[PDB]
């Protein structure tokens, strides 16, 4: 130490216990392989399931919407499904969550009608394998990132704006 440096802080056992990432491209080949092999087992059904829309907790991320975990049974009561029937279709159900507002309940209730208007139901699996219908693979109806919009207002109303 014979010049102008910052105070170094390097721990003694930093290089003695090391984990190396040599298997990174070989791991990503396997995960796409079992994902594609699982798709043929349930052929007409989609790969993923439905998720609700929630808000983020703190004030740093207060203006962001995000895919949550599961649907409360009261939002299913608005759409008209029962929880033993809705689990057999690709719908996730959460029971720990509590209802808070009206705006977050009318949003999720409208979203369940859009999913019901698209799915069909056959008799048995022999009938379903014979029909050739394109199988969806990504997320199911995700959120999309917003674009900000600036409103133009007249000159008179700025003295009485809110």
């Amino acid at each position: 130490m014979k010049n102008n440096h910052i105070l170094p802080n390097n721990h003694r056992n930093a290089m003695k216990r090391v984990k190396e990432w040599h298997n990174q491209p070989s791991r990503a080949q396997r995960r796409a392989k079992t994902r594609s092999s699982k798709a043929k087992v349930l052929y007409p059904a989609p790969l993923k399931k439905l998720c609700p829309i929630v808000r983020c907790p703190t004030i740093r991320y207060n203006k962001k919407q995000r895919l949550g975990k599961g649907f409360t049974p009261e939002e299913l009561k608005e759409a008209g499904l029962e929880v033993n029937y809705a689990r057999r279709i690709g719908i996730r159900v959460d029971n720990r969550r509590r209802n808070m507002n009206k705006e977050t309940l009318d949003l999720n209730a409208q979203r369940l009608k859009e999913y019901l208007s698209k799915i069909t139901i056959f008799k048995n699996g022999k009938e379903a394998k014979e029909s050739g219908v394109k199988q969806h693979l990504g997320r199911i109806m995700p959120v999309h990132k917003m674009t900000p919009k600036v409103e133009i207002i007249k000159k008179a109303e700025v003295a009485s704006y809110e």
């Binding site: 290089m15 090391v18 190396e20 040599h22």
Partner: protein, 223 residues
């Protein structure tokens, strides 16, 4: 470092380096545990902690693709590489799309014979020789020249062109640099199909427009 040696010390008219203990053979009494000793480990042993890969900026990797493509249309850049293009018709050249219906090797070989494209197949074939170094014993026995490249649109490679020596194929989507400029020089003789050549105008745009397929890319200006 397998043994259990220890230094004997001074007072014996002998060096300080660690000696193999025990007895009963020619081995006992010899040195160990040093880089200057026979059957001893080397100082600074190599390890797998060493960095094996480098990191390059994304916008620079797309520039080197855009430059080496333009060199394949230049005349003297191809001739300095070593290809024989004296009798070829016009460069760049683009054949019709109906090419991937060929199911035999005999049919695809006539297509090169229809143009004046045979001496590249022969000059690859006569140039095979041994390697000068110790790499003969390590799966690097023969080395030969490089021939024509063919860019197509199919996501699976064509089995008709696989056997001919000195012909490589590459899809339009991936576009490696290990083929378009081998050995750090540009000017490889390329042949384009129809649909792949028509996909270039979306892939790079003009000097003012942005690319929509490649996000945040624009061709550089002239200094």
């Amino acid at each position: 470092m397998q043994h259990s040696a220890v230094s004997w010390g001074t007072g014996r008219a002998i060096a300080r380096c660690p000696r193999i203990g025990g007895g009963g053979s020619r081995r006992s009494g010899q040195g160990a545990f040093a880089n200057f000793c026979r059957k001893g480990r080397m100082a600074h042993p190599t390890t797998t902690m060493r960095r094996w890969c480098r990191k390059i900026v994304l916008n620079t990797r797309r520039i080197a693709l855009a430059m080496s493509i333009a060199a394949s249309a230049k005349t003297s850049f191809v001739e300095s590489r070593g290809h024989k293009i004296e009798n070829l018709k016009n460069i760049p050249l683009v054949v019709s799309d109906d090419l991937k219906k060929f199911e035999k090797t005999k049919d695809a070989f006539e297509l090169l014979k229809n143009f004046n494209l045979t001496e590249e197949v022969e000059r690859v074939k006569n140039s095979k020789t041994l390697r000068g170094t110790k790499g003969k014993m390590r799966n690097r026995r023969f080395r030969m020249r490089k021939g024509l490249l063919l860019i197509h649109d199919s996501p699976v490679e064509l089995k008709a062109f696989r056997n001919i020596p000195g012909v490589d194929q590459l899809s339009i989507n991936k576009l490696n640099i290990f083929e378009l400029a081998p050995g750090g020089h540009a000017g490889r003789l390329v042949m384009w199909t129809e649909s792949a050549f028509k996909k270039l105008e979306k892939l790079f745009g003009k000097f003012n427009e942005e690319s929509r397929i490649l996000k945040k890319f624009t061709l550089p200006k002239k200094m």
